[PDB]
Amino acid sequence: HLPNGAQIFVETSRGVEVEATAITNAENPVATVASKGDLAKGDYVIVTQSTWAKMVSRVLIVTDAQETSITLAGIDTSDTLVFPAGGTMSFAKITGWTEIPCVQEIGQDGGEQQYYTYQCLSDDKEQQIPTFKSAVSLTYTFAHEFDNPIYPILRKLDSSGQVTAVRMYVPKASEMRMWAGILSFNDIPSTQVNEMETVELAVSLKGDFTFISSTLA
Amino acid sequence: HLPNGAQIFVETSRGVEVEATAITNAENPVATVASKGDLAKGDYVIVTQSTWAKMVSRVLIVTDAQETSITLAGIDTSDTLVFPAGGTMSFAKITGWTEIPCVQEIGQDGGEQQYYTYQCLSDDKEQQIPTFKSAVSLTYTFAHEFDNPIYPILRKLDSSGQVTAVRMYVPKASEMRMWAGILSFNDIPSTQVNEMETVELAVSLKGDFTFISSTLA
Amino acid sequence: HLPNGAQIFVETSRGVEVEATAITNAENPVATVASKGDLAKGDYVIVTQSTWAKMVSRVLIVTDAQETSITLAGIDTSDTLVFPAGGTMSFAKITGWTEIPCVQEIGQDGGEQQYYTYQCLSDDKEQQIPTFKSAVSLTYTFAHEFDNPIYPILRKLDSSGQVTAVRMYVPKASEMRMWAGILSFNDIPSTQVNEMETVELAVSLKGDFTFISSTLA
Amino acid sequence: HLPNGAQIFVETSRGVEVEATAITNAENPVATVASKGDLAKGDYVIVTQSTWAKMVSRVLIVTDAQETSITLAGIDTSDTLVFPAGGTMSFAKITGWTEIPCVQEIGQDGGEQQYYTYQCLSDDKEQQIPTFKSAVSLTYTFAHEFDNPIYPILRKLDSSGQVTAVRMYVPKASEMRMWAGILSFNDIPSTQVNEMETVELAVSLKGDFTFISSTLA
Amino acid sequence: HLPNGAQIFVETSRGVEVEATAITNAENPVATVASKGDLAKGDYVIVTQSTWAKMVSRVLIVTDAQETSITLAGIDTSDTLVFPAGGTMSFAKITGWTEIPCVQEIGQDGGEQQYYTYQCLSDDKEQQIPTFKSAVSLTYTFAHEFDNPIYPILRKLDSSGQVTAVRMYVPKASEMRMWAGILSFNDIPSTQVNEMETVELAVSLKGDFTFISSTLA
Amino acid sequence: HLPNGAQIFVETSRGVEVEATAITNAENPVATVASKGDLAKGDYVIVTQSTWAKMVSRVLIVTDAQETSITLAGIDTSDTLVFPAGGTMSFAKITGWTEIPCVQEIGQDGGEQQYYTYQCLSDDKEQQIPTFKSAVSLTYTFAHEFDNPIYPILRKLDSSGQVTAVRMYVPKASEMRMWAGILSFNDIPSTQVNEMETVELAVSLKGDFTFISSTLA
């Protein structure tokens, strides 16, 4: 298993909102949407709002294109009791994607669980209570091509903060990952003699990673 | 003595609670439990609560499967007076284990004894007294395989804080080490060209290490 | 694409102010200036003041030399609604340029977006909102020649703070980069045996980079 | 002079207290103890309490075994007037020793004299006066063997703080160095592939080093 | 252009003060001094006081030895309006120079322009205004020779703070640089086996560097 | 000029105090002492107290052994007016010296001039006033030999603070340096396999370095 050959894409445009009245809570979630509009098999959907704590901004996939009962399989399993019975959801389908020219470095900063420390007289050692998990950000570095159409799109997405979707596909394991976040795009290119010029892009997560097989497509 | 060939497992499920009315204090502790349930020889049991200060969250082994008096031999010796006469214990038996795919790096952070400093007009040099010992955290790095069934188990154990049990068996010296702690599992895999993808797991100890021979099994 | 052969020029002199009454907001902006004075095709014009938030100190190039309607093509697109209908802009024409003798190192310091953090009782995790982007400073290092006419010009520009214009041309991609900022010029030369002497220059950015093709000229 | 071949031993057990009424203050101190008990020549005695400021916890060796006058030769010389005329001392006889399996690294941290700084109006430069000397801690790293009997002894010594005695013998110079301190014993073994496992021990110094020749024995 | 062969001298003695009643402000300044005393061509003079803000402690060269109107050509040009009309100046002529034996390393610390930051409610980004420029310090390291007559001179100049003059002449480009500052001279020589002993000298600038051609002499 | 072959000695003992009523202030100082006692040619003297600001604890050499007029030539020249007319001095002669076994590393820490920074409303740049020079300390590292007689002497000098004298002689340049300070002597030897054991000593200056030729002796 090697990461060679993987390529990363970003969202271009999204359609109008679609409302899901009811969601089943087991294995692959099922969304009961009346008169679905252009939701075939294999499309990608971004959840924009919900009342189920998780799954707020996580990208999912539609496997069944039924008229009234859309089954957004994806990865998330709602069988756990953490998600209560009553649940609402709103999602938008993605239209197209654009590929980053030449990624040469991927690095991630963040994570780690924060704790609250206390000690009473009875206690012999200091005790801790978990409080929350810090944020995670990634930086991508790619080559400089001022004619590349990705530059206006990145500039526009940076101008107005919006939770876009990012996809990257690894061919060796036929595995597909998806996440959503805000994009802040630097554009001043660092130049060094006898070395290619590079530009750097940063993403701040708003959800969790999704792992699927490429067979679903 | 070389550490090559050692493999690490984690707890998968545990049985119902078992109560021990009385414990002897010498060499191998003996638990007087009426009508023991499926406590065969070689089993692995975790202590969940007790009033003997130590042994709160330490994993032990039963050697005798007597009807009313099981002998929790383990490693710990309670002969010292530190453990008082009257003592109660509750322990749960472990059912199955799951092995981490490919551990490539093991690191530990923590330890060290904290002191409190003071000085009087009579004293010529600053004096110190011990107060308590800091915590210990362990990190493991293993390869990325999104189909591996260990991922749902680790995600579930990370979701709800629970003091699970971890075991590592070294064949060269025929040692088996057991400890208990909380698991926090990251899942974002770092990628670098011409290098495998890695994921990292973290453990925070809640007890002390146990050293046994593999002959007991 | 290689950066070899690129050369950097600075400002020498600028003409009197020219006022634009009305500005078209789409693709290439058009400035309606009555009786334009010496605004031939290919000239470089720096914006000194405006009421459109952006374009405050960004360098542009004219393509049409019409008597009453000069088209400041540049790169900036005013089609976005961010720029309101009513708008004014004043620009100065650049006369000549002077080349830095021998640039040996280019480095950039700055960037990054600052955030404001808050957390409510209802929120489960800490939330962030962007506030503003930090400044960017560029440094250039070139060889020491005390007879070079660029030295008095740079010293004069450093003495009285003025937002001058800088151009650097990359021949491999036929791309021209322009930006404006303040110049602070150090002149003490560092000397080391068996090594040439160097003098360092610094620029404080005041605008945004403009990327154009060299065919416009 | 090379340190190869040196081996380190620790305390195992000590006898009952023995009281000294009068102490001679010159060269080798002489202790006047009525009816000494099993104080044969070459024995190791650790001082537990005294009123002579120094010699509080410094290890010494007897050379003479007279019925009422034992000579604690050691290295310490009491000829200096710092020790007053009237003096008392109590010491304990050491029974046996235990050798650390395989020391691979010895490191020290501490020392240095702290100062107090002041400056008057009349003074032209800042002046300093010494206050006291900081503490010293030693660390040892040795291989991991869970059957080694030294492990229970070290764990017991760590459990209850006691000022034990440590000896290390260098054969090349035939020199014996002794000191006393508290032992805090870590036991989590660090593991790395293609490398032996190690455990680390720490000692907090409580006295002063004694240098003697091995001919005394 | 290579710095090899350059040698550095320091001031040894200076003459009595000379007062300049009037100074012209263009290109080479001209000082109208009645009955000039021994001001031959090619001489070196340091300015000790003036009311023209700059030129306070900058070393210059006289090119004309006229009876009443000496022309202090130097490097500085007073044509700028920054220097007002009415101006007074006092300068002292230098007599002799002494050369540092063997300079092996030259390093400079200081520079950089300090800013003051503020932000208003109306402003969208933080704004800055310059306040002042920091100082510059130079260090020289040369070989140890206790018989060298330069040592008493440096010790004397260090004892009483005085703004001496320093000159360095580079033969490859025929440049001669002059600056003034205070000298603080360390004398403890660092010793290392199989390496020469070195001593270090430090200079704190009080003015600006002067760049001239060696043809003036 | 190489430092190879240099050896360092420390003071062993000193004689009774000798009082100087009058001192001449020019080149080599001359001390008017009635009925000098055993002050031949070539001896070393330590000034213990004086009212001449400098020369408080600086080692000097006696060249003339006259009955009433001792000429402490040394290095210091009192011709400067800084030393006033009236002056008293007390010095003690040194008896013997002891050599450090094997110095392998010499390092110095300290120096640098401290400044006081202020700025007025009228000033354009921040100004500084020198206040005082920091202290200087040196560390010596030598091999471990527990039989070496220098160890009791160093321990005794460390026990009671005293401004002893240290001398080190460089044979290549026939130069002799002398300084005075307090000695703090560590004795715990660091040991490493296949490496010799070392001990470290530290000195804190109370005076200035003296440079002479070895011909004086």
Author numbering:
A (entry chain H), B (entry chain L), C (entry chain G), D (entry chain K), E (entry chain I), F (entry chain J): 2 to 218
Tell me, in the authors' exact words, what the paper reports.
Siphophage T1 is representative of the T series of model Escherichia coli phages, which has been observed to infect not only sensitive strains of E. coli but also some strains of Shigella dysenteriae. Siphophages possess a long, flexible, and non-contractile tail that plays a crucial role in host recognition, cell envelope penetration, and DNA injection. Connected to the head through a connector complex, the tail of a siphophage consists of three main components: a tail tube, a tape measure protein (TMP), and a distal tip.
The flexible tail tube comprises approximately 34 hexameric rings of tail tube. The extensive disulfide bond network along the successive tail rings may mediate the flexible bending. Notably, the flexible tail tube of T1 may be mediated by the disulfide bonds between two adjacent tail rings, which allows for more efficient capture of host receptors. Notably, besides the interspace and distance between successive rings and the β-hairpin domain that contribute to the tail flexibility of siphophages, the disulfide bond network along the entire tail tube may also mediate the flexibility of the T1 tail. The flexibility of the tail may enable the receptor-binding protein to explore larger spaces for the host receptor, resulting in enhancing their competition and adaptation to hostile environments.
